[PDB]
Design an enzyme around this catalytic site. Structure first.
Site, short mmCIF file in Angstrom:
data_model
loop_
_atom_site.label_atom_id
_atom_site.label_comp_id
_atom_site.label_asym_id
_atom_site.label_seq_id
_atom_site.Cartn_x
_atom_site.Cartn_y
_atom_site.Cartn_z
N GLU A 1 -21.09 71.11 -5.59
CA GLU A 1 -20.43 70.21 -6.55
C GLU A 1 -19.03 69.79 -6.09
O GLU A 1 -18.39 68.94 -6.72
CB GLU A 1 -20.30 70.88 -7.92
CG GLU A 1 -21.56 71.54 -8.41
CD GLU A 1 -21.44 72.03 -9.83
OE1 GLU A 1 -20.30 72.12 -10.34
OE2 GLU A 1 -22.46 72.34 -10.46
N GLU B 1 -21.45 67.51 -3.59
CA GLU B 1 -22.82 67.07 -3.81
C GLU B 1 -23.57 67.86 -4.88
O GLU B 1 -23.07 68.85 -5.41
CB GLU B 1 -23.61 67.15 -2.50
CG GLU B 1 -23.38 68.41 -1.69
CD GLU B 1 -23.67 69.68 -2.48
OE1 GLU B 1 -24.83 69.90 -2.86
OE2 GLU B 1 -22.74 70.46 -2.74
#
Ligand code: NCN
Ligand code: NCN
Ligand code: MCT
Ligand code: MCT
Lengths: 346, 346
Positions: free
Chosen positions: B314, B171
């Protein structure tokens, strides 16, 4: 040898400082990449890496040898497994062979004392056919320990001249978790019972005997804890000595060395005792499932990156961790920078 | 959706049993490769992998979105960093981009609710420009949560049809460790103070406010802990919902999913609450440095392989762990067998 230990280079603080500054400016919250950043800085401090975290060729040196203490009933694997497995190493069918291949590393099988005929394809540096039984006396003489140290050291740094920038250390030898336990007990000052493990699936009923053997080896040999070489020659083994030699060689060469499991930890304890200047070049890989692993690692002040409950040896953990070292380098050279995206974080 | 959750396949015990037998016969002491063996068996149980531990193509799906709660002063990164970083994802300059490339994986940037104009090159699945401020009300309606769940699920399993056999979840969204903390607090039943962390370098002086905000979100929304979807829609976020959707999609597809950090843990808690049948497909990667990580992982009953003190997000951890999944497969298919070398161990 004294010359060897005298010339081990100190870490390059200047390159390390430039490394930290660069890492802090990368496209990410400062310090968010944790130990991956710390690793990149460590690498940049190593003179052999040319002031920057980088990885060229990779090699895993596997020291193989037999131990006289096997006769004390401390290992359930047939003694010939050492020679057989060493042969398989040349066929690329062993665990370290498969994990090394996945990491693009080359495996070097070094015979430092297998109790069998020479194995073709294997590097020959054998001191004798197995080391002496540490339960009743020394495993080898001080001269033999020092000779193998120098020999392995030279071999290692010589590889550096062929493009190798990252080393992995490993071993192979039935019954070696016994002398390893003895060494750990002597260096850390922990009771034998706290550091003796199951090794290669030793039945719980046979642990007591293993502990008594370790104690006997210590009482009878009286190794001096402040003399790593004295410890290695007395309650150690050819394979353990060899691993210690790879560590000294790489340090002298100013290059990083990835440790493996429990056996490697004891060799690392010896190496740091012999030459403290070696510590900065050591990189942990995994946390061995061997009972004495925690104690050994604490005295080495190391925290493994991988928790895989592995206890195979061969340098398999080392190979498994090589991709991590390359990731720290990739992070360093390939990430974008905050200033470029006009991002300003506290 | 109910159909989706109903069709999630159970693990193939038959393939798993054949896996264990094969692993036990490999050139090594039984169980010596620890968690690497356990991992190989888990993979073999996943219907999508065709009865064997294997890895074809790899993809990392990164769900990006903004959060209304950012206005409560719980994050020190400018809100626009989400949009800027999402753009950099398309340039291969971010952390996950670099780590994915090292692992030969492809990164998929999915916008599920960034508060900015559409970013070309980024997959568009945006529900709105940021989710509602959970401090004063719900982040979204139940319909929106369910719609995005189905949408992401379909996208994920659709990739499976293109050769992808291993997924990584991730994310990007300033202030998301707040709703993540809220979700973890609700699912585990732990007090907010025990699970609220520093996120992306939040000053120690601002922690108190973050904790109060989390408590307020819970008190005002009254999320039902026995209803994952209810929790996600109330005190969650678009990005968290999306990660949950990747997990359901891969499970339905009978494929493995690598978790990442703290944010992924909360999405995993939601996913397992919604459909317990998803658990067997989840694979941990690293142990996030976020304060509530330990608690979240314990309730998930998971033990990360990597301890890197990372807290970037990420899906960077996920990518870093992909080589490990491939190593378990290489171990399985490439190692030699004991019987072949005439080796007999107890
Ligand atoms: O590397 C470890 O942590 C490790 C832990 C336990 C056993 N071993 C391997 O097993 C052997 C030593 O076990 P043992 O029972 O014969 O003392 C040796 O050949 C090692 O490669 C290796
Ligand atoms: O993945 C983790 O464990 C992780 C832990 C802390 C912070 N983060 C990242 O930082 C952001 C969340 O931090 P924050 O302070 O804005 O709540 C988000 O964009 C994440 O990708 C990620
Ligand atoms: C620049 C940046 C800021 C916050 C993040 O979570 C991230 O992945 C990158
Ligand atoms: C077959 C075998 C037995 C013991 C070991 O330590 C090993 O690496 C392999």
């Amino acid at each position: 040898l004294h010359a060897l230990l005298r010339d081990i280079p100190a870490p390059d603080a200047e390159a390390m400082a430039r490394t930290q500054q660069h890492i802090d400016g990368l496209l990410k919250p400062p310090g968010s990449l944790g130990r991956l950043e710390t690793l990149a800085v460590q690498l940049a401090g190593m003179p052999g890496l040319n002031g920057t975290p980088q990885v060229g060729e990779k090699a895993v040196l596997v020291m193989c040898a037999d131990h006289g203490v096997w006769d004390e009933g401390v290992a359930v694997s047939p003694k010939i497994v050492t020679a057989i497995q060493a042969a398989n190493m040349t066929r690329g069918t062993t665990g370290v062979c498969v994990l090394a291949a996945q990491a693009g590393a080359k495996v070097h099988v070094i015979d430092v004392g297998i109790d069998a005929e020479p194995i073709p394809g294997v590097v020959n540096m054998r001191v004798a056919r197995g080391c002496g039984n540490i339960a009743v006396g020394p495993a080898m003489s001080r001269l033999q320990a020092e000779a193998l140290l120098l020999e392995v050291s030279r071999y290692t740094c010589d590889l550096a001249q062929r493009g190798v920038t990252l080393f992995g250390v490993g071993e192979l030898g039935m019954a070696n978790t016994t002398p390893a336990a003895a060494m750990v007990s002597v260096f850390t000052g922990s009771d034998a019972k706290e550091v003796v493990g199951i090794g290669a699936n030793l039945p719980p009923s046979r642990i007591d005997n293993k502990v008594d053997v370790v104690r006997r080896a210590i009482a009878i040999n009286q190794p001096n804890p402040r003399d790593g070489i004295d410890v290695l020659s007395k309650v150690g083994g050819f394979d353990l000595v060899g691993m210690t030699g790879v560590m000294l060689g790489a340090a002298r060469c100013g290059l990083p060395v990835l440790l493996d499991g429990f056996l490697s930890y004891s060799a690392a304890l010896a190496a740091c005792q012999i030459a403290p200047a070696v510590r900065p070049y050591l990189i942990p890989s995994h946390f061995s499932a061997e009972k004495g692993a925690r104690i050994a690692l604490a005295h080495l002040s190391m925290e493994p990156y991988l928790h895989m409950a592995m206890r195979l040896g061969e340098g398999s953990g080392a190979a498994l961790a090589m991709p991590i070292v390359e990731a720290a380098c990739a992070m360093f050279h390939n990430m974008g920078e905050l200033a470029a995206s006009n991002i300003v974080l506290p």
